[PDB]
Amino acid sequence: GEECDCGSPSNPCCDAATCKLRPGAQCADGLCCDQCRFKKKRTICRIARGDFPDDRCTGLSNDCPRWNDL
Numbered sequence: 001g002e003e004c005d006c007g008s009p010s011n012p013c014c015d016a017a018t019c020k021l022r023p024g025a026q027c028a029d030g031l032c033c034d035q036c037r038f039k040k041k042r043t044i045c046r047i048a049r050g051d052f053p054d055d056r057c058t059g060l061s062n063d064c065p066r067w068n069d070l
Contacts, residue, residue: 002019002020003019003020003021004019004020005021005027005028005062006019006021006027006028007028007029008028008029011028011029012036013025013027013028013029013035013036014028022036024036024037025037026038027062030062030063030064031043031045031046031057031062031063031064032045032057032058032059032061032062032063032064033062038059038060038061038062039057039059040059041056041057041058041059042056042059043056043057043059044056045057045064045065046064046066046067048067052067052069053067055067
């Protein structure tokens with residue numbers, strides 16, 4: 001039922017009425033979230049610390065999963 005997933009009133013992606021997103025908007029913003037909608041794979045969600053490649057998202061989430069080093 002709930003669809004709270006925003007941290008800005010001014011955000012036109014969201015509505016400050018029932019704390020939900022707009023129609024055609026899945027999320028507000030994030031490392032794996034575009035400015036209204038989800039992102040696609042091969043999106044840089046985090047940088048490597050060393051001896052690893054940059055960490056990319058899957059493109060079906062707002063969260064950013066860490067580069068599981070083996």
